[PDB]
Amino acid sequence: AEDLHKAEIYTQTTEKLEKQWPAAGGVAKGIQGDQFFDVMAAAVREDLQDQSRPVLVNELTDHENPYCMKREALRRLVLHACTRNCLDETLTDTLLDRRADLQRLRSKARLPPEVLEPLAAFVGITRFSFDRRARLNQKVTAVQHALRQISEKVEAVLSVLPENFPSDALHPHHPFRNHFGFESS
Amino acid sequence: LQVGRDLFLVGWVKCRSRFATGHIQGDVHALSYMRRYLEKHVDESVSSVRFYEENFGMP
Amino acid sequence: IPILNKVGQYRIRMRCISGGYSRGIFRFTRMARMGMLQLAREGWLKKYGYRPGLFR
Amino acid sequence: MAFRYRREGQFTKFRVHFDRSGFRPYIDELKWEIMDWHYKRAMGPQMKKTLMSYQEGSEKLQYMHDLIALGTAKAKFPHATKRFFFVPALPVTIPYRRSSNPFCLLSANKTGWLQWSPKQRVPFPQPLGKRKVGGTDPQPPVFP
Amino acid sequence: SSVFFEEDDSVYRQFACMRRVREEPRL
Amino acid sequence: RQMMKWYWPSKYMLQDVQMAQYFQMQAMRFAPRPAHVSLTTLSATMEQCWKKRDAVRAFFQSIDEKVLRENPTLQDLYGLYRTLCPDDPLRTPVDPALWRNPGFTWADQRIVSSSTN
Amino acid sequence: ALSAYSLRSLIVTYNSRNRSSMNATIENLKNALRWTSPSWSPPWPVPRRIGRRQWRVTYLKSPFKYKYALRHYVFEDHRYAFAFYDVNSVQEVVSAALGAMAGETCCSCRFSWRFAGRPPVSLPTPPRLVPSSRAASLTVLRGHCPTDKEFIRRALEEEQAVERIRKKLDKKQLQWFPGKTPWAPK
Amino acid sequence: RKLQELESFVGSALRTYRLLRPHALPFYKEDSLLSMQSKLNEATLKHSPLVHDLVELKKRNLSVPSDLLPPDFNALQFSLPVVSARGFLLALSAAANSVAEDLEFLCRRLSVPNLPHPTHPFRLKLLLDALFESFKLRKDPHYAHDWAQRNWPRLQAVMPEPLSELSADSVGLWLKAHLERVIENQRGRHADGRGRLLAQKFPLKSDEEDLYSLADDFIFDHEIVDEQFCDERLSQFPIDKAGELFRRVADFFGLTKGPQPAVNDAVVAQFQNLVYTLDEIGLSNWMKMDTREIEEFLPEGDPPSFAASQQDLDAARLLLKAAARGKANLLDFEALDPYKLLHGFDFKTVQEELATLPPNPFLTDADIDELFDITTAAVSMNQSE
Amino acid sequence: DGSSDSALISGAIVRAFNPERMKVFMHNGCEWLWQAEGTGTRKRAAAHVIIRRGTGQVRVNNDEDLYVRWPFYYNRMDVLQPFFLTGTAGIYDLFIHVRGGGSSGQAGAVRLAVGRALVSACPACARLLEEDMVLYEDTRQRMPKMPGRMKARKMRTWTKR
Amino acid sequence: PAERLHSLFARADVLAHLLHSRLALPLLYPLNSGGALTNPLAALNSIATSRWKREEVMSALATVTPLVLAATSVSRFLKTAHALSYFAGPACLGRSRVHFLRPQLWRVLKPGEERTTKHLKWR
Amino acid sequence: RNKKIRMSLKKRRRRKGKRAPCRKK
Amino acid sequence: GRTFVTPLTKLQHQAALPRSPLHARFDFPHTVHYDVFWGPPQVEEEPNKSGCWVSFRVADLKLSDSQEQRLLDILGPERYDEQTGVVCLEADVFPQLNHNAAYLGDILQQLMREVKKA
RNA sequence: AAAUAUGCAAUCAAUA
RNA sequence: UGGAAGCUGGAAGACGGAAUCGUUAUUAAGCGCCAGGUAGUCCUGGACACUGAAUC
Numbered sequence A: 001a002e003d004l005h006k007a008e009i010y011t012q013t014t015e016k017l018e019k020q021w022p023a024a025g026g027v028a029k030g031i032q033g034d035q036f037f038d039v040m041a042a043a044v045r046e047d048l049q050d051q052s053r054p055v056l057v058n059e060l061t062d063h064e065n066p067y068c069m070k071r072e073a074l075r076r077l078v079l080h081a082c083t084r085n086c087l088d089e090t091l092t093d094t095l096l097d098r099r100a101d102l103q104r105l106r107s108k109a110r111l112p113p114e115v116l117e118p119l120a121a122f123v124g125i126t127r128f129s130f131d132r133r134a135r136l137n138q139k140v141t142a143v144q145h146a147l148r149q150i151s152e153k154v155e156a157v158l159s160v161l162p163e164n165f166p167s168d169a170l171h172p173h174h175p176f177r178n179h180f181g182f183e184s185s
Numbered sequence B: 001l002q003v004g005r006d007l008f009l010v011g012w013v014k015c016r017s018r019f020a021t022g023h024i025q026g027d028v029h030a031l032s033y034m035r036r037y038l039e040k041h042v043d044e045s046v047s048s049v050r051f052y053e054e055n056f057g058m059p
Numbered sequence C: 001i002p003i004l005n006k007v008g009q010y011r012i013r014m015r016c017i018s019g020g021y022s023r024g025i026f027r028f029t030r031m032a033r034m035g036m037l038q039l040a041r042e043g044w045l046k047k048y049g050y051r052p053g054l055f056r
Numbered sequence D: 001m002a003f004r005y006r007r008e009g010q011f012t013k014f015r016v017h018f019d020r021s022g023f024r025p026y027i028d029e030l031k032w033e034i035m036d037w038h039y040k041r042a043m044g045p046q047m048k049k050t051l052m053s054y055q056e057g058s059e060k061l062q063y064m065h066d067l068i069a070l071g072t073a074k075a076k077f078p079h080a081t082k083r084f085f086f087v088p089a090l091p092v093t094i095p096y097r098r099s100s101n102p103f104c105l106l107s108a109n110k111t112g113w114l115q116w117s118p119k120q121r122v123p124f125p126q127p128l129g130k131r132k133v134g135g136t137d138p139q140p141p142v143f144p
Numbered sequence E: 001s002s003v004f005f006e007e008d009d010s011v012y013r014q015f016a017c018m019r020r021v022r023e024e025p026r027l
Numbered sequence F: 001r002q003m004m005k006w007y008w009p010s011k012y013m014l015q016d017v018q019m020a021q022y023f024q025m026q027a028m029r030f031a032p033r034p035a036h037v038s039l040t041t042l043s044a045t046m047e048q049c050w051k052k053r054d055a056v057r058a059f060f061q062s063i064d065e066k067v068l069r070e071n072p073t074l075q076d077l078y079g080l081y082r083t084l085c086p087d088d089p090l091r092t093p094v095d096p097a098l099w100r101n102p103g104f105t106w107a108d109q110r111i112v113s114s115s116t117n
Numbered sequence G: 001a002l003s004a005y006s007l008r009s010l011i012v013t014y015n016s017r018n019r020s021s022m023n024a025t026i027e028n029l030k031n032a033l034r035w036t037s038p039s040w041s042p043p044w045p046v047p048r049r050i051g052r053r054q055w056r057v058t059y060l061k062s063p064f065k066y067k068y069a070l071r072h073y074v075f076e077d078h079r080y081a082f083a084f085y086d087v088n089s090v091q092e093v094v095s096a097a098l099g100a101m102a103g104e105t106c107c108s109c110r111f112s113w114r115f116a117g118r119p120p121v122s123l124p125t126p127p128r129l130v131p132s133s134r135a136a137s138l139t140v141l142r143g144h145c146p147t148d149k150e151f152i153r154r155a156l157e158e159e160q161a162v163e164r165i166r167k168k169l170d171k172k173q174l175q176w177f178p179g180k181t182p183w184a185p186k
Numbered sequence H: 001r002k003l004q005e006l007e008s009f010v011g012s013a014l015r016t017y018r019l020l021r022p023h024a025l026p027f028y029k030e031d032s033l034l035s036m037q038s039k040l041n042e043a044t045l046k047h048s049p050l051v052h053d054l055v056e057l058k059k060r061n062l063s064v065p066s067d068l069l070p071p072d073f074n075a076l077q078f079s080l081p082v083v084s085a086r087g088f089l090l091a092l093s094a095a096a097n098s099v100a101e102d103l104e105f106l107c108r109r110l111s112v113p114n115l116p117h118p119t120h121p122f123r124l125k126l127l128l129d130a131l132f133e134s135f136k137l138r139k140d141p142h143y144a145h146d147w148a149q150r151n152w153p154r155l156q157a158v159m160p161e162p163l164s165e166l167s168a169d170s171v172g173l174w175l176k177a178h179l180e181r182v183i184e185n186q187r188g189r190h191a192d193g194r195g196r197l198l199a200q201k202f203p204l205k206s207d208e209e210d211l212y213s214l215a216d217d218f219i220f221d222h223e224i225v226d227e228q229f230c231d232e233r234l235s236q237f238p239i240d241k242a243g244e245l246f247r248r249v250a251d252f253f254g255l256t257k258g259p260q261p262a263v264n265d266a267v268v269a270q271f272q273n274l275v276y277t278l279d280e281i282g283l284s285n286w287m288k289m290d291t292r293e294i295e296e297f298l299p300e301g302d303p304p305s306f307a308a309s310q311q312d313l314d315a316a317r318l319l320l321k322a323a324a325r326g327k328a329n330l331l332d333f334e335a336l337d338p339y340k341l342l343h344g345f346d347f348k349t350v351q352e353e354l355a356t357l358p359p360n361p362f363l364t365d366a367d368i369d370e371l372f373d374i375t376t377a378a379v380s381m382n383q384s385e
Numbered sequence I: 001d002g003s004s005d006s007a008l009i010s011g012a013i014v015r016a017f018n019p020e021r022m023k024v025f026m027h028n029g030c031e032w033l034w035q036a037e038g039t040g041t042r043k044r045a046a047a048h049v050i051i052r053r054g055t056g057q058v059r060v061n062n063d064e065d066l067y068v069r070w071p072f073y074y075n076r077m078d079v080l081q082p083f084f085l086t087g088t089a090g091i092y093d094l095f096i097h098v099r100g101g102g103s104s105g106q107a108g109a110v111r112l113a114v115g116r117a118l119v120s121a122c123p124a125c126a127r128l129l130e131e132d133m134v135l136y137e138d139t140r141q142r143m144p145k146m147p148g149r150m151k152a153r154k155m156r157t158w159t160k161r
Numbered sequence J: 001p002a003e004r005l006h007s008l009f010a011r012a013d014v015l016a017h018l019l020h021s022r023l024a025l026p027l028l029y030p031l032n033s034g035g036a037l038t039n040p041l042a043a044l045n046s047i048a049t050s051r052w053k054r055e056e057v058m059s060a061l062a063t064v065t066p067l068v069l070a071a072t073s074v075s076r077f078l079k080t081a082h083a084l085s086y087f088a089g090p091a092c093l094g095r096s097r098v099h100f101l102r103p104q105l106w107r108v109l110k111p112g113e114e115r116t117t118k119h120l121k122w123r
Numbered sequence K: 001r002n003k004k005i006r007m008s009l010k011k012r013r014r015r016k017g018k019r020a021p022c023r024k025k
Numbered sequence L: 001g002r003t004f005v006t007p008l009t010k011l012q013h014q015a016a017l018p019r020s021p022l023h024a025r026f027d028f029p030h031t032v033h034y035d036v037f038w039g040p041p042q043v044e045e046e047p048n049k050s051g052c053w054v055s056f057r058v059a060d061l062k063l064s065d066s067q068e069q070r071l072l073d074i075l076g077p078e079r080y081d082e083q084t085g086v087v088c089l090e091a092d093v094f095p096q097l098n099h100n101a102a103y104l105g106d107i108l109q110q111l112m113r114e115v116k117k118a
Numbered sequence M: 001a002a003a004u005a006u007g008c009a010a011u012c013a014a015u016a
Numbered sequence N: 001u002g003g004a005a006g007c008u009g010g011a012a013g014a015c016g017g018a019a020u021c022g023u024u025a026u027u028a029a030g031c032g033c034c035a036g037g038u039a040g041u042c043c044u045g046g047a048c049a050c051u052g053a054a055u056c
Helices: A002-020 A027-033 A036-052 A066-081 A086-097 A100-106 A117-123 A132-149 A153-160 B002-007 B028-040 C033-042 D010-014 D027-054 D058-069 E009-014 E016-022 F019-028 F037-051 F053-062 F065-070 F072-084 G019-034 G090-100 G133-137 G149-173 H002-020 H027-045 H049-060 H085-109 H123-134 H141-158 H168-187 H194-199 H227-234 H239-252 H264-280 H283-288 H291-297 H310-325 H338-342 H350-355 H365-371 H374-382 I002-017 I073-086 I103-121 I123-132 J002-023 J055-084 K003-016 L007-014 L065-075 L097-117
Strands: B010-015 B020-025 D089-091 D113-115 G006-016 G046-060 G070-087 G106-115 I024-027 I030-033 I035-042 I045-053 I058-060 I092-099 L030-038 L052-057 L086-091
Touching: A002 A036, A002 A066, A027 A036, A027 G090, A036 A132, A036 F037, A036 F072, A066 A086, A066 A100, A066 H027, A086 A100, A086 G019, A086 H027, A100 G019, A100 G090, A117 L030, A117 L052, A117 L097, A132 A153, A132 F037, A132 F072, A153 E016, A153 F053, B002 B010, B002 B028, B002 H027, B020 B028, B028 H002, B028 H027, C033 G046, C033 G070, D010 G046, D027 D089, D027 F019, D058 F019, E009 E016, E009 F065, F037 F053, F037 F072, F053 F072, F065 F072, G006 G019, G006 G090, G006 G149, G019 G070, G019 G090, G070 G090, G070 G149, G090 G106, G149 L052, G149 L086, H002 H291, H027 H338, H049 H338, H085 H123, H085 H310, H085 H374, H085 J002, H085 J055, H123 J055, H141 H168, H168 I002, H194 H227, H227 H283, H227 J055, H239 H264, H239 H283, H239 I002, H239 J055, H264 H283, H264 J002, H264 J055, H283 J055, H291 J055, H310 H350, H310 H365, H310 H374, H310 J002, H365 J002, I002 J055, I030 I103, I035 I103, I045 I103, I073 I103, I073 I123, I092 I103, I103 I123, J002 J055, L007 L097, L030 L097, L052 L097, L065 L086, L065 L097, L086 L097
Parallel strands: I058 I092
Antiparallel strands: B010 B020, D089 D113, G006 G070, G006 G106, G046 G070, G106 L030, I024 I030, I035 I045, I045 I092, L030 L052, L052 L086
8 A cells, every 4th residue: 555655646746747847849849959948857857756756665666657656556456455366367457457547647658769869860960868867967067168168268168169079089099080979878 | 168268167068059058167256247147148049047056165 | 611510500400499309390489299289288379379279 | 352351361371481471489488488487486485485484583684784785774664663564576587678668567677676476366377178387296196 | 940951151160170170081 | 699599598597586685685675866967067067157157148248149059059058047047148139949938047946845645 | 950850650560469469459559549638639540450460380290100190380460550640749649659558569660750851932922913004094520630631641652652662672682592693603 | 927027128128238338348347347446445545544534533523624525525435436426417418408409499390299398308309209200101102192291291391492392292102102112122022131131120010000211111112222231231330421421411401502501511520420429339239230129128217306406516517528528437537536535645626637638629618508508407307207 | 294203303312312323324224324333252363343334345454355364255255244144235345453363263253243333233134143143252262271181182092001 | 500500419429428428337336246345445434435325326327218219310310311322213943053952961071161070080 | 303393493484584495305 | 901991981981960950961851760669578679670761752852854863873773663753762781770870861961962963 | 546565373452 | 312404315104914092063183383391402291372074
């Protein structure tokens, strides 16, 4: 019962986070646009969800999907103290699928990387990362390095900017451009 | 056969043009469901139904 | 290439996984007649689309 | 063409190579599944027996290990009158691949362990008739 | 509607570092 | 690879069940999750930008729109400065794509909520 | 331009080994779509049933001799394809498609990302016609795909063309002894 | 013998309900699902804070705070939620009266006698029965002339001009010829297709005059017809062509003509959606079978007679809005989820949940409110005897 | 008078609910559809047939002649007999799309399709085809080969001792 | 009227949705042969009443029945339209056997009907 | 192998476009 | 010489990549297709799920007659469907979808450069 | 007739 | 004496004695085609289609 209660609390927290830090225009459009505010909001929401995700007692799988967590808790309870016979043990899955709340949560999972990573690779974007926290980290590191110089000065700032770094100099052993890409998530 | 496969019942059945007989074993709830199906959920002319040799609590 | 006589692809035979027999072995099963029969009758193939009610 | 859907599978069944038909095999999955079944059936009950043997120092050992690892040990024992139930578990042995599918039930696992349940009303490897799954009865046979 | 099909040569001409970045070193 | 995938996997490499390891896993799976390096560096960058707000304004006044277009990182700096302070350092309004008005104002205190049940 | 690409089509082909599993997946997809948040209608895809495949392995009935007694082991597969067009709620559609899967059913996803190229050049208001000196002196249906039918037609024509091209290329490049070219040192 | 007849009738009623409820699991599976749901609900709710709070309050003799259970909340029956039966009845009465208004207007234009009183909860069915009784034919060519004499003037006003301008004698002669051809083609000992269609007729020999059916007896005018008709009427009806058929009927009756078409395409789309919805409750089975057995085996009962309440009116309005938006089942909303309410989880109201769902393109909230009269529905329900 | 009124009612019904049946032509005292279609199957051959009031030209698949598709007179008669039986030989031009099977199977499928098209054009004339059994769909399939047998029924020669 | 005819079918669809919602559950809902009788959920009568009355569901079904009986008029209209759509127009010894005089009896395994000839010998 | 299959292969070559004799010489 | 720049390295080195997601290096209509496989836990990777291709219409490309002829000749008749005037380019050279997509983009850019050379 | 220059299988129009 | 092809063909062989086998119409009989044995190799085994009867 406590695990089910924690799962419900986690789902409520995820809904509150979604309403508090909505992604304007859709997650895919925000990722494609790659705006600093959108990346920051997505990373903040993801990190808050990660921090708030509970640790249940009866399950050793820390599911990041509230749908999966709630469904597994319900299935465990049903198996433990709701199955009269083999027919019930088989109809457990139909019972789970017939719940309206699970139906609603079914269409609220995170976007898998492969939806856009191959498209970005085809376009030719090397300063990119499907992971919102990683993208925020890259942008923030670049901004910190630019600020370090912000104090012939615009030229130095542009030189320190990540986009203006030669590709040949990334690794000594491969003095050729367009050889390194973005790590897949 | 479909009903028994769904209900995990065991035993045997024997159907012909005008009659049917069978010996069914399984959980009490499954047996009750089978009895209800035979009494009310058969898509053929069922003029008479009879149940006999009922036993419970078998190991 | 004499060394291929010993370290070549053609020194490999399809042997039954569950029986060890080296004849009557199909890639789709990797097992001989009796291995396939035991696996099918134990009920390990129902999940994988096996239809015992089909002759042809 | 009098029976189209009846013969639907004939073309792939008869006049196509396996490597080009697109049919997906099952050997490389059932191979691991059977060993998983055997390992679980062999180890789960013994794990539960070992867990329940003492049955008095379980909470003390959990407290000490929590102190050693986390340093707080108050996650499971907020106070002296809280009971932490231990769920039997076994190592996961089948190398399932981590996938981006958010609905995968064995991709978010991080402990390398899975909970084990002795109760299952429906037997999974349902044999045909009287046949018993091999490796089920270890007692030696007795002849007349 | 912000697609920039052609890069502005003036900015790269003004800034040398971006000029070098856009430049293709000889094989 | 295909020819080396015929027989069963080794049965002597299956993990053993040990009570000590079970307790270790039980203790470890409750470990805490620290805050992300991205967010810590975001806080540090916000502090630095607030400290050097004047330099940012001078740089954006000196710069033009084409340089901002050609250097996306400068767009991130502009967005950070705009969310920190409502001032519009650039002489001319920017296109929506390069920067869209979020309507946000700053991080560890902003990102907080409380409730009970 | 990554920011301009649009998800023209997303075709999910559920591959199952059981009719019950396929039906469960279809029902789960329907229920997931039935609860999609935003005239406006849920992103109902166009169903496309695919045939059934089979395979056989033949063995004798006996452990020794008796070659005229034989047994057949028959396997089955089922495939069912659903196509979303002009997908705007990419996250919602993908989540529903992936969470619909039930039992052992797998899914193969077919993504199409389209870029419209340079936008058409806008024509201002055409010049108005004035009299001269002489004159002066004197979606609705439920369960149907909400996207445009012409859009669907164009997508289908492109899909058929690419399928023909793929078949031609594969047939030309197919070989039984790969790597062999005629008259080369064999 | 009476017990045997009662058991047979119960079986027939259960079969009729199975016909009406397609795409549903078997009865034992449904019962098992309900059992599992109830046991799960008890196991979950035994530990709820609210249950413990109420137990302590009752034990210590205190009073229950009023601001705990929302006014619309109802007690769980057998550990699982249930919707307001009175509210459902009120919504049904409102919708039935709304449709019966148009049906009665159509009947009056045709001068249908023996119309029922509007307060009757069975107003729609009574109107349909009265219409079909007024317009009935005995399938015998001898009565064709009398039927044309009695009924042709009523239909003349509504018929399109080229047919209305005709006389009653021509209609009588045409009906006589059609009936003679139908009788010949039905008694010509048809075996395949036509034989099955004839056999599908539900037996009626309780001294019941044989009545010509235009839905079934019309196509027997010609001996031989396309086998596609038989295939569609016996195996799978083209449910997707209902809009086309309705447009055909409207064109025949001259509703399409005019600068502003009287019916238009929105009405065709609405009819298509209605047919799709009826398919969910078994339209296809009705097309493939005879509905006389459905009528004769579907159980009847005493009409409801109770007193309405403010909560009942609110529930009826919410049910009408949910049905308009397509979510007619209220058990799937967070409002009727016992777990969240008992465990103190914030939940969305019915209106809040409906606000985040696609609206009905043909019926907005104001239209619902103006076109459904909960007051008259409650009056009709409160009607007695 | 009465006949005119009955014809008016029939024409109104046809216009309202059967627009395609308006375009008909008189022949041998009865109306025949200007254009009609049908389908047929036999063995692994499926055929679609369209008949339009013409001069009697038969085109098969991509503009192929009847005698080129079916060199054999019995196959030609299988295909074109229903026209003779109904008496509409030369009245209609036939267009055929056939796939699968062989010469005789395609001929049978086309015969069934032509009969169905003719009955659709003039249902009252199907009595002329009933006796000849033109409107019969033969669903018989090849007998599967059996294990332990060379063919569906053939076997090796059994040797005693 | 125009608006009345415009809204008639939408309101009929609302009624049909109500009927579908009612019919989507068992007749004696929520009664069950399991938890309902074995695990009842006094001080808790406000949130869960063990008592239950059948007259409510009986009346609900009684009101539902005539509505579906009326909805059968939709099927009647569709059948009428379907029959009209196939109207043609003005009006224009020994046994015969195919595929054997009589069906053949088989005492050996038929390759086609193995599901009925399996018990018979294969030779 | 079988003479009939050899002739079949020769006929296949002829259909593919290689004029080869069908005589079993 | 004994040391040389491999063709793929040359393609990467001479390829021009966009500065930001707001910059397009193609400028013509096209559709990018790739396949992804998802399902329950599995130990074996699904084969034939690493290739990707791009399809476009020559009329949409809107080139001169000589350039269109050069494009058709370079891509061959196998990659050209005449019924709808469509042309497709495939890339399944590596077992990784991202690598195949990057290679596909590079080869498409090189193809367009060669067409413009016409 | 300034239309065509004509042999048929065992998969695919829910897509050639 | 792995299979296929080509030039030459002085190999038997003219439907086969006592005896002997298969076969229930999309069947007999004829004809081609193809999965599998993870290089090559059967006329074997297992299938597929096309033509297609006669007889108490």
